[PDB]
């Protein structure tokens, strides 16, 4: 219920990792089979 505390000049390491993982997790959209199909499309293209 207390309001938010502003970010400091220097963040701590838990907060840098938290921001990096937030960006990666928000960007990710696929599952494991979809990722393997994209990988194997590239590998079949190069093999051909």
């Amino acid at each position: 219920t207390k309001p938010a505390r502003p970010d400091t000049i220097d963040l701590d390491e838990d907060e840098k990792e938290m921001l990096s993982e937030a960006r990666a997790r928000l960007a990710n959209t696929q599952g494991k089979k979809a990722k393997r199909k994209a990988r194997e499309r590239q590998q079949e293209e190069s093999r051909r």
Binding site: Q30, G31, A34
Partner: protein, 114 residues
Amino acid sequence: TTAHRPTFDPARGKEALRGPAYHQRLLPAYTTLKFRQPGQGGAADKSTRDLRAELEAAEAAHYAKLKGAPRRWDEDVVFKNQARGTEDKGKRKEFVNDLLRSDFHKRFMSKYVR
């Protein structure tokens, strides 16, 4: 992930494959038809107006049969007569087309969730 998907184009029925008879699929069973016997009706038409007449005859008979046509220990206490007007429930059973508010469901939840 579109592996797990709905059905927009459900499978169409096919003519049977035609070939020589080797595989045994459907064992014979109930290989005689029963027919309606004397007294079992079915093959007994009267007429439209006849059937109408027996319909209102039977229905009027049912309606006519329904209508009938041929210091004290209990004065110490603080709350009194608190169960009048409770046992008088039970005049007509009302079907309710909302399952979660039916008396059946209310009974069920009272019995099973305690």
